[PDB]
């Protein structure tokens, strides 16, 4: 004798394919076009909700990859196009009255403000941004269109809060030690997330969150080799980096009100860009990693490390932003170690050789070419180490290499804690009412 009733109950907890918007806070490329950020002290803790995540399959990563590429292209719109310079550039080595031996002093023609008058000037460039044809073409005039970035915006990661649309909910477990997924018991809900920084690199994350107690290795299929194995780090490592060149930046106007910057001259101490890493700090890191890879591969396994295989240095070496300059730094002195058999496996600083480029291709979108305006003074930027990417290559011996290339894995590295639920508040539970 049961008579069904109708409710407005809470259990709505379905999948949420959805849109999303931001809560960020000068006209720097984020543009503050989100909302003013609320103090949102509403991590409402819930009691005993068995819910399993899937960090590898969500649209939050897919939208985040779509947002920033569209947002960073939006900052690229009002800047100077600046493609009259793809001409027959001719250069030589930098002259030093005599010595032995990364710069090219370049003879160069160009238009002026007026349409007919030409301009024979000279400037400097690096190695990897110019190609032999002595005549030297630019590196991208196969197929591109060079574009200057406007010299007022900053490429600094300004953190982005995310908030749910009006009618959905952002969920996060405060629980511990996922294997990527996991039925996390304790959970709290939020309307708005915390601030996440717009950083971008490969082979090493930086300025990120920290771990709980140890390394948390994250993957999908450890028995698959084609995965990108994520490594969460417990304790951050100070990385100092520099471009120790006192450099003079001059300015010209290429046409009708189109300014342009170029490396005029350097004051005279030709150096190489580099980064210091504390040696004894780094060996203390890797002992934690092999401590866990015994548990996932075996007690009698040999953990080897090597460099990247090949490809472009964007794939090979460490991509790295710093303060309006886009470094590329070789990291061969970081994976020259082999840990053996998983049983009884200071005041120093290793230093890496780092290169400088100016013509970039962000997220491999071929055709778009953004120019790097060289800046005056010196370069110093300090960053933590938080995230690592390793790749199991295809006996119990095993070699790992620093993988990377997809920037989605960087955002997935710092958004595994979240999920979003759709809301359909309708419950039909029978009782004995009838009337």
């Amino acid at each position: 004798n049961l008579w069904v009733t109708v409710y407005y109950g809470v259990p709505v907890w379905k999948d949420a394919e959805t849109t999303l918007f931001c809560a960020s806070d000068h006209n720097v490329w984020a543009t503050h076009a989100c909302v003013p950020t609320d103090p949102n002290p509403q991590e409402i803790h819930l009691e005993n909700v068995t819910e399993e995540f899937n960090m590898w399959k969500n649209n939050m990563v897919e939208q985040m990859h779509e947002d920033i590429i569209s947002l960073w292209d939006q900052s690229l719109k009002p800047c100077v196009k600046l493609t009259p310079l793809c001409v027959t550039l001719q250069c030589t080595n930098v002259t030093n009255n005599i010595t032995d031996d990364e710069l090219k002093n370049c003879s160069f023609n160009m238009t002026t403000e007026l349409r007919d008058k030409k301009q024979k000037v000279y400037s400097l460039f690096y190695r990897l941004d110019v190609v032999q044809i002595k005549e030297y073409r630019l590196i991208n005039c196969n197929t591109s269109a060079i574009t200057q970035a406007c010299p007022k915006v900053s490429f600094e990661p300004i953190p982005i809060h995310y908030c749910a649309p009006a009618g959905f909910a952002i969920l996060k477990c405060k629980d511990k030690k996922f294997n990527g997924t996991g039925p996390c018991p304790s959970v709290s809900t939020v309307q708005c997330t915390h601030g996440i920084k717009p950083v971008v690199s490969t082979q090493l994350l930086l300025n990120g969150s920290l771990a709980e107690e140890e390394v948390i290795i994250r993957s999908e299929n450890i028995t698959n080799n084609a995965k990108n194995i994520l490594v969460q780090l417990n304790t951050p490592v100070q990385i100092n980096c520099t471009r120790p060149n006192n450099n003079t930046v001059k300015s010209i106007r290429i046409g009708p009100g189109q300014a342009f910057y170029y490396t005029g001259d350097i004051i005279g101490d030709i150096r190489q860009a580099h980064c210091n890493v504390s040696k004894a700090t780094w060996n203390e890191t890797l002992g934690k990693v092999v401590k866990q890879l015994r548990k996932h591969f075996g007690n009698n396994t040999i953990i080897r490390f090597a460099q990247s295989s090949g490809g472009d240095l964007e794939v090979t070496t460490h991509s790295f932003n710093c303060g309006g300059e886009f470094f590329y730094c070789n990291t061969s002195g970081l994976f020259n170690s082999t840990w053996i058999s998983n049983t009884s496996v200071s005041n120093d600083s290793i230093t890496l050789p780092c290169r400088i480029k100016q013509i970039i291709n962000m997220w491999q979108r071929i055709g778009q070419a953004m120019y790097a305006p060289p800046i005056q003074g010196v370069i110093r930027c300090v960053s933590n180490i938080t995230g690592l990417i390793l790749t199991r290559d295809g006996s119990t011996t095993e070699t790992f290499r620093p993988g990377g290339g997809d920037m989605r894995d960087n955002w997935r590295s710092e958004l595994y804690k979240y999920k979003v639920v759709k809301i359909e508040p309708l419950g039909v539970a029978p009782t004995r009412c009838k009337r």
Partner: protein
Amino acid sequence: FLGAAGSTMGAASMTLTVQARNLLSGIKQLQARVLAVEHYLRDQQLLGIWGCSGKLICCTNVPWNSSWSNRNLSEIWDNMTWLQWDKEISNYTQIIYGLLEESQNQQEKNEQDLL
């Protein structure tokens, strides 16, 4: 906003009054506030057809058919929480939705018009 959905059953229906007042309160962000306002509409579209016109925790007069997992509806009412029982009755939703409009809302709507 939300709370106590985890470990209770029926006593969660005591606090079904905060669950609506915070609810619903370029172009890519403008898909929000359209499907967000299409929701709270399309259910209240059919909620007026259920007979319960506004917010009342209310009973209809259509029978609960006991073919739909007849399992101790005084006992499971209080102990065994939601999100478990919901999967049990996840299969029989559409059929009740035909019984929301035929039992009370084909017969009984045209029986008060006799006077």
